[PDB]
């Protein structure tokens, strides 16, 4: 059907948050793995490739982040089901016809009994 409908700004916020993850992982190494490790661990766990394993406080924080990542997947796949599955002329009973507009012009063939069943009735 489409490309992303999901507000490109939000996708940029995703990129910003992943770099925030990288910052918070690489800072707390020296307080009790500093170049491209926790980069690829953020790409492990924030992509939920490896969801489990891969001091303790940074790990608490990161597993809260993985909880967020699961929530984000849940919300966007809920939108995948939603905006695909979620939210005419009925007859004479339309106000399209009871109040016939010139955006809704209609016609017949002349010398028809169709026009007779028109010209008999009132409204």
């Amino acid at each position: 059907s489409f490309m992303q409908p999901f507000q490109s700004t939000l996708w940029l916020l995703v990129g910003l948050s992943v770099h925030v993850v990288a910052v918070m992982l690489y800072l707390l190494d020296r307080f009790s793995l500093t170049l491209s490790s926790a980069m690829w661990f953020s790409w492990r766990v924030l992509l939920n490739s490896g969801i489990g394993e891969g001091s303790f406080s940074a790990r608490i924080l990161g597993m809260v982040w993985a909880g967020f990542a699961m929530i984000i997947v849940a919300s966007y796949t809920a939108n995948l089901a939603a905006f695909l599955v979620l939210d005419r002329i009925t007859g004479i009973n339309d106000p399209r016809l009871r109040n016939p507009s010139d955006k809704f012009i209609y016609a017949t063939v002349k010398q028809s009994s169709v026009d007779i069943y028109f010209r008999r009735q009132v409204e």
Partner: protein
């Protein structure tokens, strides 16, 4: 109408008459033309269970690591438990990991029940100081009417200061209001709300929200005084209402599209949520890195 009544040009006068108490002073009246008035047209416990069960399984892990002794339950096994929210006893934990995935599926169905089953509105009514002090809001509020109205007399009775605001914006047609709503030139409108009930339904797209979900403000036919017709009119009147023939006219003349208003929710999102939760997370580090091995 009232000149034609008083000076008796129109001995009978019907109209869609907003029957004023003021007009009742001047003219006798039958029943209200239709119901009308003044309207405004405008454009917990699952969590604790989770904590309990995770502490149970962490303790069970501690015991099973104690009974491999005939790698860190403080360390590694807890981050494994975290990963399984989202080694023979570890098989039994993989069972409960599959359980946690079932709970993920359940609250995906739940968040689908949230994000389907939103509809929001902005204006309350005269209780808004949006109307009362419009210049005490940026942008100052933009509200006009077609002059010499009975509703205008009622606001002269209410707030002629509000008329000082209205005369900055007062209009002459209903299509003036249609433009100024569809072009944002005036913010919303309050009139005899029945006309708003036609034309709000008869809006294109029907984003031009009216005077609340139909909140009638200025709540609730001319007879020359002493006309003998009045009992005849009003007894006939019960029957018309006792026959619902006005309702037959309602089926004739009323509806547009807001008659089929369809729970106007969203159809991408910018809820806060995590914007709360982010404010927690950094402070967690502010807990722990003060608690260092001081001695």
């Amino acid at each position: 109408m009232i000149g034609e009544v008083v000076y008796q040009r129109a001995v009978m006068a019907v109209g869609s008459l907003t029957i004023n108490e003021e007009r009742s002073e001047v003219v006798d009246f039958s029943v209200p033309f239709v119901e009308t008035g003044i309207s405004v047209m405008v454009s917990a416990s699952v969590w604790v269970m989770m904590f309990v069960m995770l502490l149970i399984v962490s303790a069970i892990a501690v015991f099973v690591f104690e009974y491999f002794s005939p790698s860190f339950t403080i360390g590694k096994a807890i981050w494994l438990l975290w990963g399984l929210v989202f080694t023979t006893s570890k098989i039994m934990v993989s069972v409960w990991a599959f359980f946690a995935v079932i709970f993920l599926a359940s609250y995906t169905a739940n968040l689908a029940a949230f994000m389907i089953q939103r509809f929001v509105d902005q204006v309350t009514g005269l209780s808004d100081k949006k109307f009362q002090r419009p210049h005490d809001y940026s942008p100052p509020f933009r509200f006009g009417t077609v002059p010499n109205g009975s509703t205008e007399r009622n606001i002269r009775n209410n707030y002629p200061y509000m008329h000082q605001y209205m005369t900055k914006f007062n209009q002459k047609g209903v299509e003036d209001a249609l433009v100024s709503l569809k072009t944002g030139k005036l913010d919303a409108f309050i009139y005899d709300a029945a006309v708003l009930n036609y034309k709000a339904g008869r809006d294109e797209g029907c984003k031009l929200v009216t005077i609340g979900s139909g909140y009638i403000f200025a709540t609730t036919i001319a007879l020359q005084k002493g006309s003998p017709w009045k009992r005849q009119i009003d007894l006939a009147l019960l029957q018309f209402v006792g026959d619902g023939e006005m309702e037959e006219l309602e089926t004739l003349w009323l509806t547009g599209i807001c008659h089929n208003e369809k729970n106007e929710v969203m159809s991408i999102d910018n809820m806060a949520g995590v914007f709360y939760m982010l404010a927690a997370a950094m402070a967690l580090s502010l807990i722990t890195f003060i608690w260092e091995h001081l001695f």
